[PDB]
Design a protein around this ligand. Structure first.
Ligand SMILES: Cc1cc2nc3c(=O)[nH]c(=O)nc-3n(C[C@H](O)[C@H](O)[C@H](O)CO)c2cc1N(C)C
Ligand SMILES: Cc1cc2nc3c(=O)[nH]c(=O)nc-3n(C[C@H](O)[C@H](O)[C@H](O)CO)c2cc1N(C)C
Lengths: 350, 350
């Protein structure tokens, strides 16, 4: 079978009566499906273990995930090869530790709480792909390195040094984090993975056969930033936030790369270098979005490709043909590269 | 008072009798010091909460940290402003959950275990500075951004593309991770912080008044790699592993930078760019280690500085004077940059 173990946070307060009530209705709809498990709660935190049929389990959990009485739902463990059940006795036993006064459950309550808020902290510092992998039923640390084709995405803020020059530290961080949120949301919805931030640069990747998603995610980012600029308060740093984006494609190594005590599940390869180099040429080329020939040809949609240049770098000494896409949004975003050359004054007066 | 909460792993097996025995001797030496708390164990994992006087607490914990009957000791929480005690009743009560059969502690045992291995996984993906900050009694997520002077360290592998060209993926990752371990150990012991890996590049920083530690950590790395090369098996990829290092100094922003769901506690500033640019010139300059004028002058030891060049980049259009240090190790390491231009053949035959 499949055994899922998750934790979540109360969206708003709940009383034992509502908790127990969710317990009962849980047990019933569970008995119907031969699903077994436990539900605990401790100071506004839910713990649950559910076991049963794969298709059954995922369907319950899809409903648990869209239920608005809890949030920050995180799968701690997914076992997909289960043959045994740990909670044969309960369709959905519920244990409210808040009310518990028992002598040994007490020291155990404060451990749980401390373990949990700690885990919550680490979650915030943890790459998204790690929890994906965990929810797909694998331990990230056990994945062997592998060669894979990827589209690599690289982006940064135009004239970011002017920002950090002129703005108080809290505004600078605020601006960068806004940027990073915009990119991460759109890249994730489009099926990609944001893998690293460095300075004000985003690095991400999509599966090798997803050039169209890479390009679209990028056009969407340009669009989102345009909404954000024209929507921002008067004098806002935000009104002159502009990005350059660079796309490349290549075979890369995917896996656990790092020192002994600290690793990233990430990629490593020539395409990472190429995408970064491409993004850096967006100033010279006056194109907010630049990508390689291979990204272009690997694309299968009717994009309005424009040949930009024949350019050198690296490497093997061969010139690489560089492309963008011509439409209202890239034109506006490309014009924004010029604007961004001279925002020091504007920024000065925030 | 101060309340410390940590978890650790059994270095080797222990029986309840040894566990309880550590409990008793714990309770006694604790009663002596007005220290209170709890010790739990669950399948080869120790949980402990200790409360008492700051100087008392740190002294016990210094002894706990160097005790070889457990490992992977991680402080989950440090409270330094405590006025109340949660475990007034026990100098060191011990609760072995392994033996427990109680009806509700049972579902609680499997939660603890799952929460814990999960937390263990995330630890591996988590920056070192986060646990430092936690052990110093602060929640990393609550630290406001701040301007600070830093020496930024940047390093990478010479001709790394030849490696990823010629070597199987497992060897490539093995080689990079070896590199990253060597740098991280030495940078950490010398008081610095490795903050990010990107491709095969390390980025780190030291406090602004620690140029001497920055330089020494770097010389030590060159030395460590030399030991590693000349110590490696015949034909090993390792025997042609070489690094270039770049040091810069400047005022930077330190803080939580990232999207909503994923952040790094890191730095951001011109000095980060400058150090990277400096490291890239190590090929041109034929100097394994290059650093800026400011790093030099901020240094207070009798280093054997050699002026390298007057170089341009960035930025503000001003030429920056670039330095290295002249001794047997930098000379050997600088000669290694030439060697590394032509290791494709050697690597081919591994
Ligand atoms: C902690 C918690 C546990 C839940 N467990 C279950 C569950 O085990 N089975 C189930 O069908 N539905 C559940 N639910 C919610 C149910 O999916 C929905 O109430 C109904 O099944 C939708 O018809 C749970 C909800 C919870 N809330 C408080 C966040
Ligand atoms: C789980 C565990 C808890 C410990 N707790 C304590 C403790 O609470 N107080 C203390 O003085 N010493 C301890 N110790 C170890 C002691 O520091 C040393 O045995 C002596 O104090 C050194 O004289 C603990 C050791 C442990 N091992 C099994 C990893």
């Amino acid at each position: 079978m499949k055994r899922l173990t998750y934790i979540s946070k109360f969206s708003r307060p709940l009383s034992g009566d509502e908790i127990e009530a969710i317990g009962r209705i849980s047990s019933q709809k569970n008995q119907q499906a031969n699903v077994t498990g436990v539900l605990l709660c401790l100071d506004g935190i839910f713990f649950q273990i559910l076991e049963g049929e794969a298709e059954k389990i995922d369907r319950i959990y899809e409903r648990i995930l869209a239920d608005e009485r809890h949030t920050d739902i995180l799968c701690l463990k997914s076992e997909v090869e289960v043959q045994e059940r740990m909670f044969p006795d309960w369709s959905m036993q519920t244990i409210n530790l808040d009310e518990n006064t028992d002598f040994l459950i007490r020291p155990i309550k404060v451990l749980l709480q401390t373990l949990t808020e700690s885990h919550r902290i680490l979650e915030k510092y943890t790459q998204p792909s790690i929890f994906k992998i965990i929810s797909q039923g694998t331990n990230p640390l056990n994945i062997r390195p592998k060669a894979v084709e990827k589209i690599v995405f690289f982006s940064d803020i135009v004239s970011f040094s002017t920002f950090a020059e002129k703005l108080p530290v809290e505004e600078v961080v605020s601006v960068v984090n806004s940027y990073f949120s915009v990119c991460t949301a759109i890249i994730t919805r489009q099926g990609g993975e944001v893998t690293k931030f460095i300075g004000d640069c985003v690095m991400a990747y999509f599966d090798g056969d997803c050039a169209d998603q890479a390009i679209q995610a990028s056009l969407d980012i340009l669009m989102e930033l345009e909404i954000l600029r024209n929507s921002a308060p008067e004098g806002s740093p935000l009104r002159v936030l502009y990005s350059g984006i660079g796309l490349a494609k290549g075979k890369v190594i995917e896996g656990n790369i790092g020192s002994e005590l600290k690793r990233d599940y990430t990629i490593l390869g020539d395409a990472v270098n190429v995408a970064a180099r491409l993004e850096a040429l967006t100033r010279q080329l006056s194109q907010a979005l630049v990508f390689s020939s291979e990204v272009k040809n690997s694309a299968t949609k009717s994009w309005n490709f424009i040949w930009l240049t024949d350019s050198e770098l690296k490497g093997k000494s061969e010139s690489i043909d560089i492309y963008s896409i011509d439409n209202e949004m890239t034109r506006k975003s490309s014009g924004g590269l010029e604007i961004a050359r001279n925002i020091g004054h504007y920024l000065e007066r925030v």
